[PDB]
C-alpha cells in the first residue's frame, strides 16, 4: 500500500484512444523508477528537465500518469514543442514540460487481422489544445457556412478518425502505448529516499 | 460556387518571388485542410504545402525555406508566397481542399522560372 | 523513412466496354484509409474519382471501384466508356506529410 501503482497504468490490458486521454492522478506513495526505467523495455524514454535516472530521490506533490495509444511515427510527436494530428488536437505537452515520456510496441496488443477501430484520433478540430486539453466531443465538424445539425455530409465530418490498426502495417503504423509522466508541486510522492 | 480560383502565375528570373491566390467558394478556407501541389509540363503531381485548421503548416522538402503558405480569413483566400524561384519550379499550381482525398481543386495557374 | 507509391502499367490499352484494372503499390503496408484516386484529361485538373481506397465519391459513375488493403490498392474501371480515357493517380494521404502520388497510368484507346 506504500508504492506507486505504475502497474496499474502501464502493464494494463487496454489503453484509451488518444483524443480521450487517459490520466491517472498519484499521490502518496513511492515511486521506484528503477523497475521503470531499468527494465528497458521501452521503444521510447525521455526525461525532459530532469535526469532519467537519479530521479528516485526526488519528491512531488503528486504525479500524474497519462496514458494512451498511437501509431509508431506520431511517438515522436509527443514532446514539448511539436505540431502534428495527435500534437495539435489530440495531446499537448507543454512548452516548458518537466517529466518523461515513455512508449512501447504494442502490435501483439491491440492489432487485429481485419482492423481494430476501436483506436481513434481527433481528425478534425478548428484550434490547437491548450496543453494538457482534453477534447472527447462526437459533434459533426462544420467545415462551411451550412449548418451540420448533426449529419454527415460535404463540409459535414466525423471529428474522429479510427486508425484500423492491422498487424500488418509498417512499425510507424502499428500501435503504440505511450505514458507520460508529469511531476507537479506539500510533497508526498517520493522516491526511495 | 464551390469553386477555387486561382491566380498570380506568371514569368519570374531565377531568385524571383510570386504569390499565388487562391479564392474559394463553398466552403471555410479556415476551416479546412489547405493543400498546394504542382505538376510540371509533361510530369505528374507532386504535392508542395499544407495548411491545418489548427494554423500548423507543412512544406515538401524541396520548396523548405523558400516557399511559405498562408490564408486570409476575411477574403477566404489562401497564399502561396513563392522566394528564391528555381527554374525546377516551373509547373502548373493548383490549391485543393483536402476532406477524405483532395474533393475540391482550382482551374490551376502557371508558374514559369527562367533567365 | 518515406512512402513510394508505385503503378503499373504506365500506359494501358483498352477498348470501350472493357473491363481495366490500375495497380498502385506502397513501400511499406499502410492503412487503407490513406489512399484515393484521381483522374485527369489533358490541360485540365484532376478529378478526384475514390478515396479511402474504396469509398465511390459523390458523382462519380458506378463502373469506377476501388479496392485494396497493405500494399497493394486497384481502380477497376468495370465497363470503358469513351469518357473514362485519361490520366489515373493513387495518392496516399499521410496524416502526417508529405502526401505522395502515383506515377499516374495513361489509359489509351487499343487499335
Known amino acids: 500500500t506504500n508504492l506507486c501503482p505504475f502497474g496499474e497504468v502501464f502493464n494494463a490490458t487496454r489503453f484509451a484512444s488518444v483524443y480521450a486521454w487517459n490520466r491517472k492522478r498519484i499521490s502518496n506513495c513511492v515511486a521506484d523508477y528503477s523497475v521503470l526505467y531499468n527494465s528497458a523495455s521501452f521503444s521510447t524514454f525521455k526525461c525532459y528537465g530532469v535526469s532519467p535516472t537519479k530521479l528516485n530521490d526526488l519528491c512531488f506533490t503528486n504525479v500524474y500518469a497519462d496514458s494512451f495509444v498511437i501509431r509508431g511515427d506520431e511517438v515522436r510527436q509527443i514532446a514539448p514543442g511539436q505540431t502534428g494530428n495527435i500534437a495539435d488536437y489530440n495531446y499537448k505537452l507543454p512548452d516548458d514540460f518537466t517529466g518523461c515520456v515513455i512508449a512501447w510496441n504494442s502490435n501483439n496488443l491491440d492489432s487485429k487481422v481485419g482492423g481494430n477501430y476501436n483506436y481513434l484520433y481527433r481528425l478534425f478540430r478548428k484550434s490547437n489544445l491548450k496543453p494538457f486539453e482534453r477534447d472527447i466531443s462526437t459533434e459533426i465538424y462544420q467545415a462551411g457556412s451550412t449548418p451540420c445539425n448533426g449529419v454527415k455530409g460535404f463540409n459535414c465530418y466525423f471529428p474522429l478518425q479510427s486508425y484500423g490498426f492491422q498487424p500488418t502495417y509498417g512499425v510507424g503504423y502499428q500501435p503504440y502505448r505511450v505514458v507520460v509522466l508529469s511531476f507537479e508541486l506539500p510533497a508526498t510522492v517520493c522516491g526511495p529516499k | 460556387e464551390v469553386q477555387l480560383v486561382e491566380s498570380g502565375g506568371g514569368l519570374v528570373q531565377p531568385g524571383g518571388s510570386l504569390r499565388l491566390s487562391c479564392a474559394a467558394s463553398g466552403f471555410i478556407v479556415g476551416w479546412n485542410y489547405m493543400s498546394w501541389v504542382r505538376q510540371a509540363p509533361g510530369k505528374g503531381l507532386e504535392w508542395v504545402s499544407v495548411?491545418?485548421?489548427?494554423?500548423?503548416?507543412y512544406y515538401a522538402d524541396s520548396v523548405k525555406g523558400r516557399f511559405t503558405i498562408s490564408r486570409h480569413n476575411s477574403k477566404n483566400t489562401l497564399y502561396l508566397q513563392m522566394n528564391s524561384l528555381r527554374a525546377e519550379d516551373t509547373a502548373v499550381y493548383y490549391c485543393?481542399?483536402?476532406?477524405?482525398?483532395?474533393?475540391?481543386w482550382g482551374q490551376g495557374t502557371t508558374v514559369t522560372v527562367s533567365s | 523513412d518515406d512512402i513510394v507509391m508505385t503503378q503499373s502499367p504506365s500506359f494501358l490499352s483498352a477498348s470501350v466496354g472493357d473491363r481495366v484494372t490500375i495497380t498502385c503499390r506502397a513501400s511499406?503496408?499502410?492503412?487503407?484509409?490513406?489512399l484515393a484516386w484521381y483522374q485527369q484529361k489533358p490541360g485540365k485538373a484532376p478529378k478526384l474519382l475514390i478515396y479511402?481506397?474504396?469509398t465511390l465519391q459523390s458523382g462519380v459513375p458506378s463502373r469506377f471501384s476501388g479496392s485494396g488493403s497493405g500494399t497493394e490498392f486497384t481502380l477497376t474501371i468495370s465497363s470503358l466508356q469513351p469518357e473514362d480515357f485519361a490520366t489515373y493517380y493513387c495518392?496516399?494521404?499521410?496524416?502526417?506529410?508529405?502526401?505522395?502520388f502515383g506515377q499516374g497510368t495513361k489509359l489509351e484507346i487499343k487499335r
Open positions: 479511402a481506397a474504396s
Open positions: 511499406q503496408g499502410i492503412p487503407s484509409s490513406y
Open positions: 495518392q496516399q494521404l499521410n496524416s502526417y506529410p508529405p502526401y505522395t
Open positions: 485543393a481542399r483536402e476532406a477524405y482525398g483532395m474533393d475540391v
Open positions: 495548411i491545418y485548421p489548427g494554423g500548423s503548416t
